């Protein structure tokens, strides 16, 4: 019953087309709760979940000031990085940053993170001890040194293991009805002939929360990973998730296959068989 709070930041430059675009988003577990979009007329951090709307003007004003400061730093980052990598002035580039914290079922701190990528590649990351940095580049080593002199890791440590966890516990209680819910997957199988001698067997998991789930097919109780078509878990759009797994079986062997479903919402993992 672990949880987490995570902020996601994306900055994309657009040469000769004005300011870089900046998008910030925040999540509690798999539920998004705030956003900020540099191209929006609002110029404000905005609510994306009903339980966050109760926060007063002091919270919104504060998060707006901070998200604008994040936006500005990434503005600068973009130009600095072109320079470190001596690349053209006219090419669009992307910078990404993510940070947050995880807590266990007891809501105690498990780990913290703060990572940064340039054009989709790891740039610099805070290690798990929250004291050292990983820099897989000569340019990333230059950033590592400035961040070391500024004692940035010590400041992030206080936030990740203190402030970050403090806000996650508050959001978890304020939005308990949504965030502390366990919606077990509604399951069913579909069968479809593909030919005279083969049929498709699809196992469905619908309307579940949280998103974490294991869904597998086995033949005579044996692993069939190679022969299983498994789609990545996807959002229904109403706060729940969906996933399906399928195997092509020779007609008349339906009874040899079993779909297995494991999810926090289920007391006991489920085993289904077309029968």
């Amino acid at each position: 019953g672990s949880h987490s709070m995570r902020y996601f930041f994306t900055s994309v430059s657009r040469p000769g087309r004005g300011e870089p675009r900046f998008i910030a988003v925040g999540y509690v577990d798999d539920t998004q709760f705030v956003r900020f979009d540099s191209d929006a007329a609002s110029q404000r951090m905005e609510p994306r979940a009903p339980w966050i709307e109760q926060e007063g003007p002091e919270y919104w004003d504060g998060e707006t000031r901070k998200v604008k400061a994040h936006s500005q730093t990434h503005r600068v980052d973009l130009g600095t990085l072109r320079g470190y990598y001596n690349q053209s002035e006219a090419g669009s580039h992307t910078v990404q940053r993510m940070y947050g914290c995880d807590v266990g079922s007891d809501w105690r701190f498990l780990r913290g993170y703060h990572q940064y990528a340039y054009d989709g590649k790891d740039y610099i990351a805070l290690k798990e001890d929250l004291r050292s940095w990983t820099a897989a580049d000569m340019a990333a080593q230059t950033t590592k040194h400035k961040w070391e002199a500024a004692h940035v890791a010590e400041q992030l440590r206080a936030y990740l293991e203190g402030t970050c966890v403090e806000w996650l516990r508050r959001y978890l209680e304020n939005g308990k009805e949504t965030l502390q819910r366990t919606d077990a997957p509604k399951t069913h199988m579909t069968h479809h002939a593909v030919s005279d001698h083969e049929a498709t067997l699809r196992c469905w998991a619908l309307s579940f929360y949280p998103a974490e789930i294991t869904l597998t097919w086995q033949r005579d109780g044996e692993d069939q990973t190679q022969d299983t078509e498994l789609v990545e878990t996807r959002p229904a759009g109403d706060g729940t998730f969906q996933k399906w797994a399928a195997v092509v079986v020779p007609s008349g062997q339906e009874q040899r296959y079993t779909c297995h479903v494991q999810h926090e919402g289920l007391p006991k993992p489920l085993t289904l068989r077309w029968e």
């Binding site: 998200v67 730093t73 400041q155 402030t163």
Partner: peptide
């Protein structure tokens, strides 16, 4: 809530 310190330019 967002972090208020430690977000330094690269």
């Amino acid at each position: 809530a967002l972090a208020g310190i430690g977000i330094l330019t690269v």
